[PDB]
Amino acid sequence: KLKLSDWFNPFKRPEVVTMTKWKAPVVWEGTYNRAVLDNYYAKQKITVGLTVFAVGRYIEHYLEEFLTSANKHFMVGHPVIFYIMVDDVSRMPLIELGPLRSFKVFKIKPEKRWQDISMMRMKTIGEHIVAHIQHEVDFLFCMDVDQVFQDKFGVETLGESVAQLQAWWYKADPNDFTYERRKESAAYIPFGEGDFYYHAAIFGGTPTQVLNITQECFKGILKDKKNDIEAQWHDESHLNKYFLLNKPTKILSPEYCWDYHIGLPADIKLVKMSWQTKEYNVVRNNV
């Protein structure tokens, strides 16, 4: 049976947070033994899933670059299935995939508001988990399209529920976090509460856990609509509320989702994924 000490050494990164108060590891470059994990997971013959949405001009701007980088960097050495959700399949870039990669594409309805496009992902992911993903993979990541894999994003990131530290807020105090602060929203987190600010651009876990994550987030999204309120950062606000109540069993350092606009400080040793520059004037059609 895989124990934390088998693969995780926090002492390799003494100047950062490596363990939570609930004993979940925060995975930083230097702390993980990928060789040990690759061997362990290869013997289990795991398959890892990855969902990605591209609706509207997000397709032309980001989808090819995401998928090309995912092919190269995501869980290399293990079977991987990319689940691609687009509103227009005729604009799907059909890139060549390498060994142990395969994919499938689904046509989805485009929501009128970009905010609803972002939030509806929670409903859609859950539907696909029930319909097929639960039978296909051992672990699933759900990711934003507006980012690019830069280096190996491997089995060290796998767990029962996996959260991502948002690049801008990882050193901040909880009372500075951009949680939803209105008690009328289901995403509400009071001042004096909170562990971390999680980025909604990457989350994952077992199909069972991701199903619960997305189900509970979407319930909150629906409740808010009935109360004529919309959380400040939409699905991300709801995701943060979820992970407050249901603590992630693993957290990823900002190295796994880094914004180069910040620069590259000492803490960020090897970037695995980077944000694309925002292009809202083109890719979004409403305020």
Ligand X SMILES: O=[N+]([O-])c1ccc(O[C@@H]2O[C@H](CO)[C@H](O)[C@H](O)[C@H]2O)cc1
The binding site for Mn(2+) consists of 144, 146
Residue selected from 58, 74, 83, 139 as contacting ligand UDP according to rule CB under 6 A: 58
* Backbone φ and ψ of 26, nearest 5°: -105, 115
Terminal-to-terminal C-alpha distance of the chain: 50
Residue selected from 118, 164, 209, 249 as contacting ligand UDP according to rule CB under 6 A: 118
> What is the nearest approach in angstroms of ligand 147 to the Cβ of residue 76?
27
Per-residue interface string for the shown chain with Mn ion, residues 189-218, x marking contact by CB under 5 A? ------------x-----------------
Q: Which of these segments, 111-119, 130-138, 164-172, 207-215, binds ligand UDP (CB under 6 A)?
A: 111-119
User: Are 63 and 93 spatial neighbours (Cβ–Cβ below 8 Å)?
Assistant: yes
Selection from Mn ion, ligand UDP, ligand X, none that 29 binds (CB < 5 to 8 A by kind) is none
Residue written as token pair 């060549």: 96
Active site residue 127: no
Q: In a 10 Å sphere around its CB, with 0-12 CB exposed, 13-18 middle and 19+ buried, how is residue 228 labelled?
A: exposed
- Residues numbered 219 to 248 that lie near ligand X (CB under 6 A) are 233, 236
CA–CA gap between residue 266 and residue 15 (Å, rounded): 10
Decide: is 92 part of the binding site for its own copies (CB under 8 A). yes
Residues linked to residue 273 through DSSP beta bridges, in sequence order? 149
Q: Which residues does 219 contact at the CB level (< 8 Å), separation at least 6?
A: 186
- In the chain, DSSP finds a helix count (H) and a strand count (E) of 8, 10
Q: Which of these segments, 5-13, 99-107, 154-162, 188-196, binds its own copies (CB under 8 A)?
A: 99-107
Residue selected from 38, 146, 195, 255 as contacting Mn ion according to rule CB under 5 A: 146
Contacting positions for its own copies (CB under 8 A): 45, 47, 79, 81, 89-90, 92, 94, 96-107, 131-132, 135-136
